[PDB]
Design an enzyme around this catalytic site. Structure first.
Site, PDB file in Angstrom:
ATOM      1  N   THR A  69       0.861  -1.174   0.000  1.00  0.00           N
ATOM      2  CA  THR A  69       0.000   0.000   0.000  1.00  0.00           C
ATOM      3  C   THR A  69       0.906   1.236   0.000  1.00  0.00           C
ATOM      4  O   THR A  69       1.803   1.349   0.838  1.00  0.00           O
ATOM      5  CB  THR A  69      -0.909   0.010   1.253  1.00  0.00           C
ATOM      6  OG1 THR A  69      -1.707  -1.185   1.275  1.00  0.00           O
ATOM      7  CG2 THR A  69      -1.810   1.237   1.245  1.00  0.00           C
TER       8      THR A  69
ATOM      9  N   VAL B  40       2.185   5.312   0.181  1.00  0.00           N
ATOM     10  CA  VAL B  40       1.982   6.534   0.937  1.00  0.00           C
ATOM     11  C   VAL B  40       1.713   7.614  -0.117  1.00  0.00           C
ATOM     12  O   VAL B  40       2.130   7.485  -1.269  1.00  0.00           O
ATOM     13  CB  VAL B  40       3.243   6.950   1.760  1.00  0.00           C
ATOM     14  CG1 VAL B  40       3.655   5.834   2.699  1.00  0.00           C
ATOM     15  CG2 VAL B  40       4.381   7.320   0.832  1.00  0.00           C
TER      16      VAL B  40
ATOM     17  N   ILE C 187       4.835  -1.103   3.031  1.00  0.00           N
ATOM     18  CA  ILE C 187       4.485   0.284   2.771  1.00  0.00           C
ATOM     19  C   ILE C 187       5.308   0.676   1.551  1.00  0.00           C
ATOM     20  O   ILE C 187       6.534   0.524   1.543  1.00  0.00           O
ATOM     21  CB  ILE C 187       4.847   1.202   3.953  1.00  0.00           C
ATOM     22  CG1 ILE C 187       3.981   0.848   5.169  1.00  0.00           C
ATOM     23  CG2 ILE C 187       4.632   2.657   3.566  1.00  0.00           C
ATOM     24  CD1 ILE C 187       2.477   0.906   4.892  1.00  0.00           C
ATOM     25  N   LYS C 188       4.632   1.162   0.516  1.00  0.00           N
ATOM     26  CA  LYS C 188       5.300   1.541  -0.718  1.00  0.00           C
ATOM     27  C   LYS C 188       5.642   3.035  -0.785  1.00  0.00           C
ATOM     28  O   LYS C 188       4.787   3.889  -0.542  1.00  0.00           O
ATOM     29  CB  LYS C 188       4.419   1.137  -1.913  1.00  0.00           C
ATOM     30  CG  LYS C 188       4.887   1.672  -3.251  1.00  0.00           C
ATOM     31  CD  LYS C 188       4.001   1.204  -4.408  1.00  0.00           C
ATOM     32  CE  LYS C 188       4.184  -0.271  -4.699  1.00  0.00           C
ATOM     33  NZ  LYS C 188       3.535  -0.660  -5.985  1.00  0.00           N
ATOM     34  N   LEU C 189       6.894   3.338  -1.114  1.00  0.00           N
ATOM     35  CA  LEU C 189       7.360   4.719  -1.236  1.00  0.00           C
ATOM     36  C   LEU C 189       8.190   4.882  -2.501  1.00  0.00           C
ATOM     37  O   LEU C 189       8.858   3.940  -2.932  1.00  0.00           O
ATOM     38  CB  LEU C 189       8.234   5.113  -0.037  1.00  0.00           C
ATOM     39  CG  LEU C 189       7.667   5.003   1.376  1.00  0.00           C
ATOM     40  CD1 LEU C 189       8.230   3.765   2.051  1.00  0.00           C
ATOM     41  CD2 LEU C 189       8.042   6.243   2.169  1.00  0.00           C
TER      42      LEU C 189
END
EC number: 2.2.1.2
Lengths: 316, 316
Positions: free
Chosen positions: A94, A96, A130-132
């Protein structure tokens, strides 16, 4: 047997979509989403319940419209992830807010907020990524998050400098792009057709894979963004590959076993000194393609984030 | 009268070249050079004495070949500036190694080294402008240098974010580009022809000029890089304009007075809060043209720097 089944012998299959229908059909280990896929998924009629659910929850958390839109948008992304986690044994990625891509502190806070929402739903951190975006700031944010028990998926990786910096930061996984690199060359170069083996995107991931295994880095290499199955087959052996439903269908309908292409059989070598911010910036900007595509990828994800907020805003 | 003479009523004329022949012909107030112009100037037969002079001096400063090449290259840039200062009443702009564009500390040290060489020749700081690329790191380097009595010329300025950050850092002068912006649009847009008033490069400098005068910033605005005299005339009134000899010739051979185009007649307005690094990066990268051109400009200047070192290396 079919190509999909054969690929699973060498590579972990991941579905690149927010549509649960694909999870049931291809039974991937993990699933990945991004702002653009979340926007598309929000259009799916059966997902209406997830939206009303996010809005209702938001209104119960505060009476500030500004905060309600933010809570509703984040909750929707999480609600979709929750539906997917019911169908896959692995992780969900998912992202940010892409508008925070050049802000380390804001990105760390947003990531913790998303983790909080998953935890409130009873999901532990080992089922999430967490995808950045892989800017210097995103990489620094990820290094800190990993130390705090939050695993990250560093995406929009185009240059070798980004790949090196991610490995040195100890991130859980990287998503080096293949397709968008091909797009750049088709639009900015004379050559418009590439044999799988010469596809610029394939060469990029292959070199990154070699560098990682050669130095014993534990960061998972997951190729992403594909334009044809040729690119996928040429990368058989990559730790994982996240593929769109359309290409997943093609692989499943094509008969014939495939052979492993990516491998490292030597011994691990010593790691060099860590790259500094100045060296990272110099090297990243030496790559015309990477310069264009990283910035562009962030712009598009931000636009889709805004469109989602718009949509949610009209429901408050 | 001719256009050149007429332009001088509204704008300070600056010659963009390292060739002293142009100084005698057009009598500009200041002169600007960059790595590419220094390389070209090194090809001029009469400049041979300046090269041998730089090499001789370098060999007398140390016996380390690596250091001799660096000293010889820096001394040549300074020797050319010295010749120019004998023909102009104003300043000479000399650039720091473009390879240090993303390194604040290294850029500060290099700038002080160049200042040292000019001082050793008896030239005071008020006759010099150290030129640096307008990356966030170069802007931070300039802010520090200005506090130490070293005036800077911030170049390769393409986005409004760069313009704003430069003004807030209190730099002596900025060189916003016009021509290269036009190049980008001609290559990445359907429209291939632009009326002077609609030239993207002209619009960019006009907006920067307005923003600067409107807020009482003392930073000198000097438009640079031109493709035709139409762009120059459309900017009549800009504080200064640095023009290539070829366009200077065209202006001097065209009869007719011109009218002032750039002006700000209102009252000064209050300045906003300073932009942060995160906001700067977000805004700069929102501009596809600026993203491409800043990185590209730095790459080309670095390549020319290397070619010069090569040339000097074969003379040691």
């Amino acid at each position: 047997t079919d190509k999909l089944t054969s690929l699973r012998q060498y590579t972990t299959v991941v579905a690149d979509t927010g549509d649960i229908a694909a999870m049931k059909l291809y039974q991937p280990q993990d699933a990945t989403t991004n702002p653009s896929l979340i926007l598309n998924a929000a259009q799916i009629p059966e997902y209406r319940k997830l939206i009303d659910d996010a809005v209702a929850w938001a209104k119960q958390q505060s009476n500030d419209r500004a905060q309600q839109i933010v809570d509703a948008t984040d909750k929707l992304a999480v609600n979709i992830g929750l539906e997917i986690l019911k169908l896959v044994p692995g992780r969900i990625s998912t992202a940010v807010d892409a508008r925070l891509s050049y802000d380390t502190e804001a990105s760390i806070a947003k990531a913790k907020r998303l983790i909080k929402l998953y935890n409130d739903a009873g999901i532990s951190n080992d089922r999430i990524l967490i995808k950045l975006a892989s800017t210097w700031q995103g990489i620094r944010a990820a290094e800190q998050l990993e130390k705090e028990g939050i695993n990250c998926n560093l995406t929009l990786l185009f240059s070798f400098a980004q790949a090196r910096a991610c490995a040195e930061a100890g991130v859980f996984l990287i998503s080096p792009f293949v397709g968008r690199i091909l797009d750049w060359y088709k639009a900015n170069t004379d050559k418009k057709e590439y044999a799988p083996a010469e596809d610029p995107g394939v060469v990029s991931v292959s070199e990154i894979y070699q560098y990682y295994k050669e130095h014993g880095y534990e960061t998972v290499v997951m190729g992403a963004s594909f334009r044809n199955i040729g690119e996928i087959l040429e990368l058989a052996g990559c730790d994982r590959l996240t593929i769109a439903p359309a290409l997943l269908k093609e692989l499943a309908e094509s008969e014939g076993a495939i052979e492993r292409k990516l491998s490292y059989t030597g011994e691990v070598k010593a790691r060099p000194a860590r790259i500094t911010e100045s060296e990272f910036l110099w090297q990243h900007n030496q790559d015309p393609m990477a310069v264009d595509k990283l910035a562009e990828g962030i712009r598009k994800f931000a636009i889709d984030q805004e469109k989602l907020e718009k949509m949610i805003g009209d429901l408050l």
